[PDB]
Design a protein around this nucleic acid. Structure first.
Lengths: 94, 95
DNA sequence: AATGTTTAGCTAAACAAG
DNA sequence: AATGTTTAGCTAAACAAG
């Protein structure tokens, strides 16, 4: 169970193109710790829809909290360079 | 954007794709038909037909990269992101 | 007018976790 | 059994270009 403080939630949704329903679901789950099931029930949504709603806000938070100084990069690379990049990632993981 | 039937089959190889999307994508990319023809015939929105074409085109773009090349995404220290950006230019210059 | 695009958001239903 | 995740495929409706 991923959780956010209100401060972290405010950061997550600042500038985010997100509707009121998604905000309410995400706050209830991530900030208040309520089950996603409660919103699926009350809003007449599939479990997958509620899962995606929480994920949209979580993903936004993650994008604003990358390690200090780090950049996301995407590139088409030859085999040996692609290997090096994946190994930088793998070694950073563990 | 246009494809031969061979390129089209390459595009969809290993792709999870249903026949309706295959029909739309072939019609547009291979046979050169407007997307509009499929929105009408299949009762779909324009955006659905546009996405259908996109799903197969994107798959083709990945298959059609040079042998041994791959699209990688990573979150890295700035200096390593810099190295990757340079490599990306080196690869473009070679191709 | 006509045609094609973008993306937040949702479905279906298999799947993964609890 | 209940609950949460994934993703090709869909719409909505606003935007892009002619």
């Amino acid at each position: 169970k991923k959780r956010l403080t209100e401060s972290q939630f405010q950061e997550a949704i600042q500038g985010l193109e997100v509707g009121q329903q998604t905000i309410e679901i995400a706050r209830g789950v991530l900030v208040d710790g309520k089950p996603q099931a409660t919103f699926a029930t009350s809003l007449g949504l599939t479990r997958g829809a509620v899962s995606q709603a929480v994920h949209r806000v979580w993903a936004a938070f993650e994008d604003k909290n990358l390690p200090e100084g780090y950049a996301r990069v995407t590139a088409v690379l030859p085999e040996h360079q692609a290997y090096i990049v994946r190994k930088w990632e793998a070694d950073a993981k563990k």
